[model samples]
Target: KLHKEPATLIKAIDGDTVKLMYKGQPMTFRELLVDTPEFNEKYGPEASAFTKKMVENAKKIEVEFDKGQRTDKYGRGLAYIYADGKMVNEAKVRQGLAKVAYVYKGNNTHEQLLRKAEAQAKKEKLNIWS
Candidate 1:
């Protein structure tokens, strides 16, 4: 089972990145297994807005790490983010704001769910898929 850690959103860097207070220290976290367009790219602002709205309105935020390398080469923590008990990573994919990518074997704890969300997004032609 993945370990859940409580966190407070310091800020959202983008659709897939955030600065959060974890264990009393502010750290950057890259959302696992999902990628969003860069801030200047097409549809980028929409994706960031979606994430910001979700986290900003949430009363509780938490993060979970998969059973593998916890940090990327950039020293940013890789995690599955939850806002008010909703999986933000999956929600981004469901809304077609992010694409399921950067998946690695044994570290993809939520791969199936992500794929399902992406599939539905594709079928609906939502956001990025549109």
Candidate 2:
């Protein structure tokens, strides 16, 4: 239960909920959701904080949406994020903090390539990998 409320940042509800804002309009990110380990778990707050820290004060983020624009059962705009012209999701994946969460064969902006980038981050153990 999160919604993208702006172009540069997202109001992450919990680990998988966010309000995504695009081009001055608010869109709900449907499928691109992930669960940051719980506070009582291993990384807990650390993992969640890691995500917030990365985007807390960041600005001028460029966001790309899947052309197909499929809404979930709850009606959220699923998309991939590009912060500072960099693929934030991809980085998250490559660093092992997140895993590939591909769903729906629809056009999700840049799919395979972005997934590849994240895979690299996972192999590198940038943040969540450890």
Candidate 3:
């Protein structure tokens, strides 16, 4: 079974990185599977803005972690973010603002879903794909 932890987004550092309040401590989440451009890179601002909007509009936010390493080597949490019941990590790619960048073979439960979302965005020539 997956673990769901209640979280509150404190800031969106970039498209893929967000600071959140979880377990009474602040944590940085490196969005799973999808990577948006950096804040200073091309289309980075738009991706960041989109993520910020989703986070702000969500009535509830939670982090879903699988049975693998909880945090990355850099100390950032590696998980999928759920905002108002929607998975924001995959939404980034589906919206064409991000691309599938990283994946751990046995650890990701949403791999297929993320792949499909990215494919659709690519076919549609969405944002980054454009």
TM-score of each: 0.97, 0.65, 0.93
lDDT of 1 by residue, 1-130 (tens): 8978899999988889999998898899999999999999988999999999998889999999999988899989899999999999999999999999999997899999999999999999999999
lDDT of 2: 0.56
Compared with the true structure, what per-residue lDDT tens digits does model 3 show for residues 1-130? 7767899989877788889998989999988888788878888999999999999888899999877878999999988899988999889989899888778875688888999999999999988888
State the lDDT at 19 in candidate 3. 94
lDDT of 2 by residue, 65-120 (tens): 66565566677766665555555566555555665664556654455765786667
C-alpha lDDT of all candidate models, in order: 0.94, 0.56, 0.88
Ranking by TM-score: 1, 3, 2
Off by over 4 Å in 2: 1-10, 15-17, 23-27, 30-44, 125-130
Q: Is candidate 1 or candidate 3 better by TM-score?
A: 1
lDDT at 36 for candidate 3? 86
Number of clashes recorded per candidate: 0, 19, 0
